[PDB]
Design a protein around this ligand. Structure first.
Ligand SMILES: CC1=CC(=O)c2ccccc2C1=O
Ligand SMILES: CC1=CC(=O)c2ccccc2C1=O
Lengths: 103, 103
């Protein structure tokens, strides 16, 4: 029902983006098992050499589906997400989070 | 009376941001003594590991208070500011300057 697209902007260079991705690798199976989660995928740009593509190498884009806002909010308080946030605090600069419905 | 917030964007890496901060260290006491100056503080992001914070490592945020636009404009013509501008010309990319009043 809700679709979340979250862009996580990482610090340039020094394998910061990979550090974050590695933290997601630890957590994604767990998140998929959370109540109300119907998708949770960290994505990165893939250079297709087409003129219409825009790329941001220092970013990870999450695509997620949650049954409700309550389920998303619960997600954010889980220990795996608190552990994730602590683990990536020196790697992440900001997040831009959209909550979307069918248009 | 006027509050100025100026974001100074610096060149990535190569201690450019520190070079600029060092130039501010030279000038801040002088600026505070300028007529009509009631605050002049170069600030940087401080990573608090909270999800709601946005950080830009290649930026310095000035928070200032000036008694009037004339006082600010005079500030910009002082020798310490002309010397500052010359000193940082290879370190700074741009500035975004807001002049604010109580809402
Ligand atoms: C604040 C915040 C932190 C996250 O780690 C996070 C992870 C996945 C989806 C959304 C979010 C979010 O809104
Ligand atoms: C153009 C310009 C240059 C500065 O160096 C500067 C320094 C402090 C406050 C404002 C400014 C400003 O508007």
């Amino acid at each position: 029902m809700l679709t979340v697209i979250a862009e996580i902007r990482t610090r340039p260079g020094q394998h910061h983006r990979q550090a974050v991705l590695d933290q997601f690798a630890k957590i994604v199976p767990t998140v998929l098992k959370e109540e109300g989660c119907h998708g949770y995928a960290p994505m990165v740009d893939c250079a297709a050499g087409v003129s219409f593509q825009s790329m941001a190498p220092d970013s990870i884009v999450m695509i997620e589906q949650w049954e409700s806002i309550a389920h998303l909010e619960a997600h954010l308080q889980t220990p795996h997400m608190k552990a994730y946030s602590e683990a990536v605090k020196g790697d992440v600069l900001e997040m831009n989070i959209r909550i979307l419905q069918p248009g």
